[PDB]
Design goal:
The structure is cut from a larger assembly and holds 2 copies of chain A (about 475 residues), 3 copies of chain B, 1 copy of chain C (about 50 residues) and 1 copy of chain D (about 325 residues). With about 475 residues, chain A is of the alpha/beta class. Helices cover about 35% and strands about 20% of the residues of chain A. An 8-stranded mixed sheet of chain A has the order 8-12-11-13-14-10-15-16, sandwiched between helices. Chain B is an alpha/beta fold and about 400 residues long. In chain B, strands 8-14-13-15-16-12-17-18 form an 8-stranded mixed sheet, with helices on both faces. A 6-stranded antiparallel barrel of chain B has the order 1-2-5-4-3-6. The N and C termini of chain B lie far apart (about 70 Å). At the C-D interface, α1 of C face α1, α2 and α15 of D. Bound molecules: adenosine-5'-triphosphate (2 copies) and magnesium ion (MG) (2 copies). Chain F: Produces ATP from ADP in the presence of a proton gradient across the membrane. The alpha chain is a regulatory subunit.
Chain lengths: ~475, ~400, ~50, ~325, ~475, ~35, ~50
């Protein structure tokens, strides 16, 4: 029979059940908050068995007004979310309740948000390149179709702008289905993305799930699983090619840390939950593609305090095929898309996959930029003047390369007004080969800002 | 053909036994996040394998006066309160045998590659004592990595431990997988004194990365003699803490039988994190960097079992290539330095060198192999005697 | 390399066909075997023959 | 060569699938046959008898200080109550329960009396000036013996006094010759609590007043005309001092304590159906032979086992259930 | 009378005894593990009295297989180890069980592993130099005969190679007894040392006690004390000169830290036990020599995190007469043995002991190297030509001095292939006097690299 | 109320010799010695 | 949705308010800015950053 609340510790609630009717882990429980100003049907997710028939649960809605001793009824199944083509074109919350029209999706097929990752036997390595149209991405961090991609960065570096840019580049012409998971990000950005997709007519092909900042840690960590459940349904049952954008997946681990602190679990290195790796993997292992059915995932990742050694980014690095680190230094120079060319990497940037010419040009560019970084120690104090002539030429073409990796993105229009530009892979390879060989050392550095292309480079040079 | 299919099941059915034994039970009184406390089981041994109802195995680490704190090695989602817990009567152990070659197995030895069951010869406990000082002989047989830098500057010999340590995407897995692939020519000889068997332990690696490694091994013909002990990210901290020990046990079975083994641990850093998680969930007070006080005893207990056995013990060997991921090129961190002090040599792959063109990116100055010339053929010992110091200078 | 890959793919396809037919035949035989196998398994489970 | 190995692996995989299909069909059909055969009562009793024949061939939570103190208090209680009549034992029990309740409520007095000391004279003086004029002489003597000695924790004093209180009713039953009746009827209470988990969880006087808990008990369980009076008094006394322990577990432990005071050990037995009297006596004899003590057998007969008996005594279990056999057969398939 | 295991937590076991039979602190208890694969007799050492007749003990062998309630018997005495001339030429573990010949010492005199250090009355400072044949050690950090010597170094900077070299240089030309204590080090190094000593016919004068890192924390705590007990028997009961090599003494404190939290002690500084100084002092002050009977102790020390400010090395520095501080910087530069000339010190480097000629050259070398260290900042950025002429010439001298402090060590033939060398102290003094005065400034730098003396320097210069 | 008075009398009731109840690592806990 | 970074270095030099351009930015702005103000201030941010 029904249980009874015995402790409330913020968004964590302890509930005592009869001696033999204790719910299973991740089961959904329902409690009632009857205070008029904020009465609601509080939803709890069982997280631990404390003994003595007590279970400690994570609240999805904020436990305000909840009273000790209120009846708690277990649904007998984990939190479930709607699935099917019906979800496409609508905005859902962490629990599957539609937002643009609340009655939607009740009669749709429901899937539990907790599921084992696909068996190892069904995993294959994805290596097909996804030509985004960004010079930096298409040259140094070639994204993988069907693989996991990350956009690392701190505050105000361009993660969300890149996410929307790759929505324009990939989703706008994608032949399958898309899912967007707002995990602990702004509701303003969620609404902006909603209107943008409605205007671009991409909304009908995408399912939006939002667990935005104002929500307690419970939904702020289960929203990713809900969006992943919709994406998994599209991947498996419908056989569609799926895109899965997740902004921002660090908030999943942050909510996990908060819940861990509330659950009494001892803190880890820098206060994170001890199960950071486990809780991160149980999600990321599900975002994998399998043999005959692909899921291209792109995940913004927050790097708190711009500390790339923080346990959350350090853990999430191991679950990525392509990684694009965004740095404060590149952002201050005005070199949007803000990518650190040296920290970023891709698993398909191998000569056997991207080709000999692409790999050679990428390696030469990386060499020039690494030499420039190594010379920073002298550049800061004495300037360019005191370097050796070979190093002087290297640094000049390194500045030009660093600035040419900048591009005018479509998502940047709203900021700059200048329309975005697309540069195909062949042109990028040719342009950077010429840059490394020194064929453009006579042009001013100002010509390479946000230019996107050889022809448009010549245009701006003539303008200057 | 159909005769064998019928006969296998027929033999199983005939061998089925109705024997019953005085099994002893406890009851779960607390569960969650991979840890379960079991009241009862008065005769449970420390580090014993407990059997939970869903075929889920755990290991009894804490033995208090009240409850037995056990780490669930598997899916803890189904471990409810009040469930029966039976004691296996067997200390933490995994199956071992030649059947494990060319397979991908969980830290418990049960296969996950989707192929059949593994016909284990026996079961080896994960915590047998490492060979003593009198049971070893000097590392003298070279293990050819196939990489000029390693074989010339920091040679890896059969029985010694070479820590491949570096930042992300520096070439650690590339070096280890190339080492495994380079043993195919030795394997094809058919000579146990030259064959090098391999056990690639994957810890906290996304399943597709383990699939990539397996594909690379297959295309190189290496799965014929390589085992993969996969503890992918998804599995709870228990498997990620147990996987190096399972791989070391599988290798040790061959080692004590006079065969040469090569163990790769990608990454011992992810083992330390998993052990930290288990200890903090068991509520052990942590030490420095929030790690358990005895993380050093974890990595040492693991690596020190890689040894070159004396002729009285069959003359086998187990070569360990532990992999460590240093954050931000800091070789002075805690776990990196622990593993460096535990191992016989280090290959420090630096991102700066990797970008400069030095592939693989061995920082010659930091890297060293304490076996040195003893792990090289006379030719390379002569033409490359001082190569590492010359390059450092 | 390409010739060997093509030959291997053709051999795999031919196996997937002929071996599938062989498996169908063996399954037909196992269908008759099931009755006796289950009877003996139940006899062992209960004990006292039957 | 790699392609040859791959086709050989494909053949092995197909062999595996054929074997798995054959084994799955065989085990499913075997389970059907087992369920059909064991369903007949004659076959069920035959399996029970075969299992019995097969078997025929086959203060713990108190630390040192508390353990010795409870042993000494039990020795004093045995010396004293030996000369007391049923009314005297009842008075002893009620006064011990009342002082236990007072100690439970008056935590400061409990800590003062239980805090170990070299000299017990201050403790005896504190006990006398507070209880000597409120309880009988024998109860005061038992309390003096309990308090004078040293306990590991404060709660252990309540545990010891409550244990003596329980032993009071136990010896009252023993002199009355009601031992068997109280044992069986306490087992009946245990069954009733097990069948009503909400009721058992609700008798926690830790969460409510003990008077209300005992009132609920009387209205629900011991108010039935057919209950033995001694058992009702025992369980009411236990619940009024329950201190957060589950009522069902408390009653099971109380029945185990009663049988231990008799000397026997109780083994909980589950069977597909109630066994015959010959089956009962054979089970008792074989269990006593195995465990070297007179074993009291309680049958929890349930059809889920679908066959032979299952036994649970202490931490040990014998598992002859046909359901366990089916599970083993299904899981052991290659 | 016998105890009873109540609680097992890793290497720590709690044993409950009857009231009148609680074992004393540091007593040795015996339990039995009967599991077939791990069957053994487990030796526990009482570390705390918890009350209510409970004692808490460290396990000298792994507790795997140990069962609650298993009988525990009291030996009535602390862990005892064999002593006598018999121990020489054999290999023992921390408990005194011989390894190369099991049951060898069971009939010898057994001494308690725990004993107080000699009284302050018996102590006398040692001021005799121990010439070893290494340029750096003999010049900058002269070793003290009868004193305490240490080899500090981060992870993997050559502590084992250097301690083996100094075994070769001291013990092989030394008529007294020698004792080696492999405290928590690599077993391969210990086996190589055993084989080397057997081949060199020095084993008969050497007693080896190994508690290598495969052993649980208790064995690493007590192997040092066992070897040291053998050492003090050779000191006090035979009046014979003794060498006590310990590799590595930090492992004693580290093992103490591993069981520190399980014993109920709150952590201190960076995770270390509160009793770090007390325990390490109790162990170290036993190593001291007393007047008329000398122990020349040579103990490597590990520097965790390569940080010399770590509490363990910092507290160990106070127990040493000579300190050779190895560093990873020198090792990376290629200057093996990797001794840090500046951070290293010796209390016998006094003009009243080593002679004014030795002291002046040592101090000039230290001054030159310190000035070079200061100038390395300018050189890397501004350049070498921007220095003063005197400072430029000093930089040349300093580079040559750093490379001359390197030496081809006998135990490092595997590192370099070439055989070792022994440089007499007077030759070292003359060579470094000349270097500081510039008589070898005209030779190339490589002429001084890994060269053992002036004759070899001339040969290498003529070769280059 | 009278319970509090009895407790007050008991507490005000207090050579003095104690007993070591816990020892280890240089620290010993001594039961007794009310006037220390 | 955007930060106005007031630098102390500019504040001490008399530049009050010390809005550090480039680092300072408004994201949800631009859409909400009267047309005349936008027309006159379009080039101002670039000019000051340069
Ligand atoms: N390509 C670009 N061109 C011009 N301005 C840009 C560009 N990319 C980013 N910006 C500026 O930087 C701001 C960064 O916005 P964005 O939402 O991407 O930040 P973020 O740091 O990735 O996100 P968050 O605050 O959620 O961590 C943009 O609002 C805009 O002000
Ligand atoms: N010697 C080499 N020459 C060229 N490319 C190399 C070499 N070694 C590695 N790479 C490439 O560099 C990247 C390093 O990948 P790898 O998995 O080997 O690194 P890692 O240090 O093990 O990384 P991680 O911690 O992510 O697993 C891959 O692109 C690999 O293809
Ligand atoms: Mg954002
Ligand atoms: Mg790797």
């Amino acid at each position: 029979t029904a249980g009874r609340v015995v402790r409330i510790t913020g968004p964590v609630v302890d509930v005592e059940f009869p001696r033999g009717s204790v719910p299973e882990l991740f089961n959904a429980l329902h409690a009632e908050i009857t205070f008029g100003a904020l009465a609601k049907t509080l939803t709890l997710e069982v997280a631990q068995h404390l003994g003595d028939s007590l279970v400690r649960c994570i609240s999805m809605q904020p436990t305000d007004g909840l009273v000790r001793g209120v009846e708690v009824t277990d649904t007998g199944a984990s939190i479930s979310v709607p699935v099917g083509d019906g979800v496409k074109g609508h905005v859902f919350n962490a629990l599957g309740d539609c937002l643009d029209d609340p009655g939607y999706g009740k009669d749709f097929e429901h899937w539990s948000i907790h599921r084992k990752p696909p068996a190892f036997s069904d995993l294959e390595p994805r290596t097909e390149m996804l030509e985004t149209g960004l010079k930096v991405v298409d040259l140094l961090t070639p994204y993988v179709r069907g693989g996991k991609i990350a956009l690392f960065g701190g505050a105000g570096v361009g993660k969300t702008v890149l996410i929307q840019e790759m929505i324009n580049r990939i989703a706008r012409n994608f032949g399958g289905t898309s899912v967007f998971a707002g995990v602990g990000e702004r509701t303003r950005e969620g609404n902006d993305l909603w209107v943008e997709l409605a205007d671009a007519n991409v909304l009908k092909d995408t399912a939006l799930v939002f667990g935005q900042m104002d929500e307690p840690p419970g939904t702020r960590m289960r929203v990713a699983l809900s969006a992943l459940t919709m994406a998994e349904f599209f991947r498996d049952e419908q056989g569609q090619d799926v895109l899965l954008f997740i902004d921002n997946i660090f908030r999943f681990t942050q909510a996990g840390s908060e819940v861990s602190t509330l659950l009494g679990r001892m803190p880890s290195a820098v206060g994170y939950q001890p199960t950071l790796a486990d809780e991160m993997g149980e999600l990321q292992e599900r975002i994998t593609s399998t043999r005959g059915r692909s899921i291209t995932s792109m995940q913004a990742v927050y790097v708190p305090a711009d500390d790339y050694t923080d346990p959350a980014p350090a853990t999430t690095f191991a679950h990525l095929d392509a990684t694009t680190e965004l740095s404060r230094a590149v952002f201050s120079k005005g070199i949007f898309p803000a990518v650190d060319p040296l920290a970023s990497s891709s698993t398909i940037l191998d000569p056997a996959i991207v080709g000999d010419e692409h790999y050679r040009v990428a390696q030469e560019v990386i060499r020039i930029l690494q030499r420039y970084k190594d010379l920073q120690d002298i550049i800061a104090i004495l300037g360019i003047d005191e370097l050796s002539e070979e190093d002087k030429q290297l640094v000049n073409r390194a500045r030009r390369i660093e600035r040419f990796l900048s591009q005018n993105m479509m998502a940047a229009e709203q900021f700059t007004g200048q329309p975005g530009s697309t540069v195909p892979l062949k042109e990028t390879i040719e342009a950077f080969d010429k840059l490394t060989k020194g064929e453009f050392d006579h042009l001013p550095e100002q010509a390479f800002f946000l230019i996107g292309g050889l022809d448009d480079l010549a245009k701006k040079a003539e303008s200057l | 053909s159909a005769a064998d299919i019928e006969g296998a099941i027929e033999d199983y059915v005939s061998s089925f036994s109705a024997d019953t034994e005085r099994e002893e039970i406890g009851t779960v009184i607390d569960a969650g996040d991979g840890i379960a406390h079991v009241e009862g089981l008065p005769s449970v041994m420390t580090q014993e394998l407990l059997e939970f109802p869903g075929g889920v195995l755990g290991v009894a680490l804490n033995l208090d006066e009240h409850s037995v704190g056990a780490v669930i090695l598997g899916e803890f989602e189904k471990i409810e309160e009040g469930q029966q817990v039976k004691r296996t009567g067997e200390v933490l152990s995994v199956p071992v045998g030649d059947a494990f070659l060319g397979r991908v197995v969980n830290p418990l030895g049960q296969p996950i590659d989707g192929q059949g069951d593994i016909a284990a010869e026996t079961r080896r406990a994960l915590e047998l004592q490492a060979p003593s000082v009198v049971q070893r002989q000097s590392v003298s047989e070279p293990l050819q990595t196939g990489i000029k830098a390693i074989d010339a500057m920091t040679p890896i010999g059969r029985g010694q431990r070479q820590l491949i340590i570096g930042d992300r995407k520096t070439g650690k897995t590339a070096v280890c997988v190339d080492t495994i692939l380079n043993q195919r020519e030795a394997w094809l000889t058919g000579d146990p004194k030259q064959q090098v068997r391999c056990v690639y332990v994957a810890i906290g690696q996304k399943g597709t990365t383990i699939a990539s490694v397996k594909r690379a091994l297959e295309e190189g013909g290496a799965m014929e003699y390589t085992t993969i002990v996969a503890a992918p990210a998804s599995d709870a901290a228990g498997f990620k803490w147990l996987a190096p020990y399972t791989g070391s046990a599988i290798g040790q079975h061959w080692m004590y039988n006079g065969k040469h083994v090569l163990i790769v641990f990608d990454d011992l850093s992810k083992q330390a994190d998993a052990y930290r998680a288990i200890s903090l969930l068991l509520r052990r007070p942590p030490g420095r960097e929030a790690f358990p006080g005895d993380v050093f005893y974890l990595h040492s207990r693991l690596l020190e079992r890689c040894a070159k056995l004396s002729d009285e013990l069959g003359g086998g060997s187990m070569t360990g290539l532990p992999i460590i991921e240093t954050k931000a090129n800091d070789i002075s961190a805690f776990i990196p330095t622990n593993v460096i002090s535990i191992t016989d040599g280090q290959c420090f792959l630096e991102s700066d060198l990797f970008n400069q063109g030095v592939r693989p990116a061995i920082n010659v100055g930091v890297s060293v192999s304490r076996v040195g010339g003893a792990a090289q053929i006379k030719a390379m010992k002569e033409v490359a005697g001082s190569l590492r110091l010359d390059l450092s200078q | 390399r390409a010739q060997a890959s093509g030959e291997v793919a053709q051999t795999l396809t031919q196996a997937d066909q002929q071996l599938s037919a062989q498996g169908d035949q063996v399954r037909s035989g196992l269908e008759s075997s099931v009755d006796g196998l289950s009877a003996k398994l139940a006899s062992r489970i209960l004990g006292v023959d039957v | 060569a790699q392609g040859a190995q791959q086709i050989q692996l494909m053949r092995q995989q197909l062999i595996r699938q054929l074997r798995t299909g054959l084994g799955a069909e065989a085990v499913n059909k075997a389970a059907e046959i087992v369920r059909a055969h064991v369903a007949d009562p004659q076959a069920q009793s035959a399996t029970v008898d075969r299992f019995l024949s097969e078997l025929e061939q086959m203060t713990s939570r108190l630390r040192a200080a508390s353990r010795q103190s409870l042993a000494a208090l039990v020795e004093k209680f045995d010396s004293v109550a030996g000369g007391l009549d049923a009314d005297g034992l009842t008075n002893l029990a009620d006064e011990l329960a009342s002082v236990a309740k007072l100690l439970l409520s008056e935590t400061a007095l409990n800590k003062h009396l239980a805090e170990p000391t070299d000299d017990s004279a201050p403790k005896v003086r504190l006990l006398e000036r507070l209880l000597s004029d409120k309880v009988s002489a024998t109860t005061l003597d038992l309390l003096r013996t309990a308090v004078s000695n040293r306990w590991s924790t404060e709660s252990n004093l309540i545990d010891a006094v409550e244990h003596t209180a329980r032993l009071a009713l136990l010896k009252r039953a023993e002199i009355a010759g009601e031992v068997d009746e109280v044992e069986e009827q306490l087992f009946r209470f245990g069954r009733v609590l097990d069948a009503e988990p909400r009721l058992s969880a609700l008798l926690s006087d830790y969460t409510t007043p003990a008077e209300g808990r005992v009132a609920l008990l009387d209205k629900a369980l011991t108010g039935r005309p057919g209950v033995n009076q001694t058992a009702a008094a025992l369980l009411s006394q236990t619940v009024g001092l329950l201190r957060g322990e589950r009522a069902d577990e408390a009653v099971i432990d109380l029945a185990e304590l009663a049988v231990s005071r008799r000397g026997e050990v109780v083994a909980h037995v589950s069977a597909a159906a109630e066994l015959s009297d010959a089956q009962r006596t054979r089970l008792t004899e074989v269990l006593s032979r195995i465990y070297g003590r007179p074993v009291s057998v309680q049958l929890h007969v349930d059809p889920e086992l679908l066959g032979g008996l299952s036994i649970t005594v202490g931490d040990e279990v014998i598992d002859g259930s046909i359901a366990s056999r089916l599970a083993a057969a299904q899981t052991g398939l290659p």
